[PDB]
Write a protein that binds this ligand. Structure first.
Ligand SMILES: CC1(C)CC(C)(C)c2cc(C3(c4ccc(C(=O)O)cc4)OCCO3)ccc21
Ligand SMILES: CC1(C)CC(C)(C)c2cc(C3(c4ccc(C(=O)O)cc4)OCCO3)ccc21
Lengths: 213, 11, 213, 11
């Protein structure tokens, strides 16, 4: 009903002077890819069109952040952007965004690497974030809650089977989500500020996610 | 409201 | 080693014109109670004194929010303050803080009630929040990570035993944590604003948690 | 730095 093999295929179908300008460029590019990603997640396309909007608008940060963090596993003190460019710890710090960059590095990338999070687990965590019943405006929130329940039950059962020696790997995965949430909110703030000041080029799709509400 | 997103969620 | 019976006793040992002034009054009162709560959590007092500071300073919002939300289960569209006063949805909205108040109601209180979260589970979720290895400054973060691992392994084993008909109750509990995180950050913002403006009395302990860093 | 908190975490 909610197969981890299908969620994995959604992830695999998606694989490709101012550092902040380069990071925002990569963000906009991935927003298009994210919409295509969401569709490949079982039952998401079957949700009403308005609810698909509400879901993607509420989680786009966390969804994108999870993606470039897992991509950056084999990177020393930095992140690999979707554009192909690497961005190092010092490059971001010198751009005046080192505090949040280090949070991404320490709380996600690093934590992902040490447990060697696979693409199926990354996909499931992303799918859990996607099916957020707490998203305001949702027409039928219980339907979105039920789809979340099906993703994590599949993820647990995937974990108990693929890594049966690590009895607490399931909870370990789920406990990166508050960090992702916290880091996601702090990104929005930054992005709102890059907008307010106007010293950073911001492409059309990224600009639309920064429009109200 | 959300122009680009709606157009991409189409089909 | 990390018994749920002992965590439960920590919770039970703690049980007792402007609505925002009344809520902040209740906040300060509970900050003293929180410090006493943390001590009763196994191995917390054994952590270096500086690390105990870092832990409580990083999670005090989420720790307190979890407490008054679970307290408010049998309350219709409102929260029960520790001072004994009830605060209704309309009272908060009229005070100009309805948006966040409803978030507390919808994402926590309500979600707690529907699954009938017990005091042991509330305690464990609080203990997980307390032992946050992502807290910056921590002398030995791996030690705090290990204590977290022991709380949720105990919580899972408690859940599989007390509610063996609800196979996904463990994940359901852990997935209220991102909401708690998100709601916790939004509280800080409000509290910083009540401070900046100065139109709300703020007691000494609450003021110290609002000092930098 | 954090006066009240340190005093309460004492003992
Ligand atoms: C420059 C900052 C604030 C720092 C940080 C690295 C955390 C970051 C991340 C983003 C970003 C993003 C960055 C990179 C990518 C990507 O290359 O896949 C996708 C998204 O995440 C939230 C939306 O856009 C956007 C801006 C920024
Ligand atoms: C008035 C607002 C912003 C709204 C809301 C109800 C979310 C709230 C909550 C608090 C509060 C708090 C409120 C009540 C209590 C309590 O009575 O136990 C403890 C803490 O939580 C974070 C720190 O203080 C402080 C302020 C506020």
């Amino acid at each position: 009903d909610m197969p981890v093999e299908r969620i994995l295929e959604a992830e695999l179908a998606v694989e490709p002077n101012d550092p902040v300008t380069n990071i925002c460029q990569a963000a906009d590019k991935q927003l298009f890819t994210l919409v295509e990603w969401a569709k490949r997640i079982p039952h998401f396309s079957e949700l009403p069109l308005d609810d698909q909007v509400i879901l993607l608008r509420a989680g786009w940060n966390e969804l994108l952040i999870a993606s470039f963090s897992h991509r950056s596993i084999a990177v020393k003190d930095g992140i690999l952007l979707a554009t192909g460019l690497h961005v190092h710890r010092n490059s971001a710090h010198s751009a005046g965004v080192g505090a949040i960059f280090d949070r991404v590095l320490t709380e996600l990338v690093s934590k992902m690497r040490d447990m060697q999070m696979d693409k199926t687990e990354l996909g499931c965590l992303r799918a859990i974030v996607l099916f957020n019943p707490d998203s305001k405006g949702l027409s039928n929130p219980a339907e979105v809650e039920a789809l979340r329940e099906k993703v994590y039950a599949s993820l647990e059962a995937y974990c108990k089977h693929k890594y049966p020696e690590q009895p607490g790997r399931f909870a370990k995965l789920l406990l990166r989500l508050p960090a992702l949430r916290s880091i996601g909110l702090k990104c929005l703030e930054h992005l709102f500020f890059f907008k307010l000041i106007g010293d950073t080029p911001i492409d059309t799709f990224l600009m639309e996610m920064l429009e109200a509400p | 409201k959300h122009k680009i997103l709606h157009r991409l969620l189409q089909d």
